[PDB]
């Protein structure tokens, strides 16, 4: 496959251990397609410029996933309608 470095922020209204559940389950669904996601990150509660859905700032996030080719549209489209992930912009990774 190819590297997919897609990082989509978590919602600011989330709770703490529920946010850990969101990263846990969302990381599981991203990891179900054979992609050993060899990267991670947590940029912290960092304010954005304009609102995403309702915040004046959110809890930023990152990702580093190495897979196909099989689950980039899965982790983007299957997370497009969640309540936690505000707006996931899954950029390609060829730097």
């Amino acid at each position: 496959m190819r590297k997919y470095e897609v990082m989509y922020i978590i919602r600011p209204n989330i709770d703490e251990e529920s946010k850990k559940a969101v990263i846990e389950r969302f990381n599981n669904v991203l990891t179900s397609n054979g992609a050993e996601i060899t990267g991670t990150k947590d940029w912290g509660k960092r304010r954005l410029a304009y609102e995403i859905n309702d915040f004046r700032d959110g809890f930023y996030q990152i990702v580093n996933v190495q897979s196909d080719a099989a689950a980039v549209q899965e982790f983007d489209r299957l997370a497009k309608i969640s309540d936690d992930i505000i707006r996931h912009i899954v950029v390609k990774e060829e730097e």
Binding site: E5, M7, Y8, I9, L48, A49, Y50, I52, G58, I62, R87, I89, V91, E95
Partner: protein, 71 residues
């Protein structure tokens, strides 16, 4: 003579970034009112202004740099 002031602005210490994880050179690139910087007044190269413009957009898509500013 014989060069540009602010000589190439990225070719001296680049290259190939950023884009998402960078907010620093993105902080020094996207202009004061909110627009992207002019490529004559900033001073980037051809490929430098191309990469910093693409990463300026792709870093503006994930809400990193503001899609509009104040006056």
């Amino acid at each position: 003579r014989a060069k540009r002031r602010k000589v190439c602005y990225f070719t001296s210490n680049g290259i190939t970034h950023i884009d998402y994880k960078d907010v620093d050179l993105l902080k020094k690139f996207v202009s004061e009112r909110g627009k992207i910087l002019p490529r004559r007044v900033t001073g980037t190269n051809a490929k430098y202004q191309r990469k910093l413009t693409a990463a300026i957009k792709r870093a503006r898509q994930m809400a990193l740099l503001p899609y509009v500013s104040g006056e």
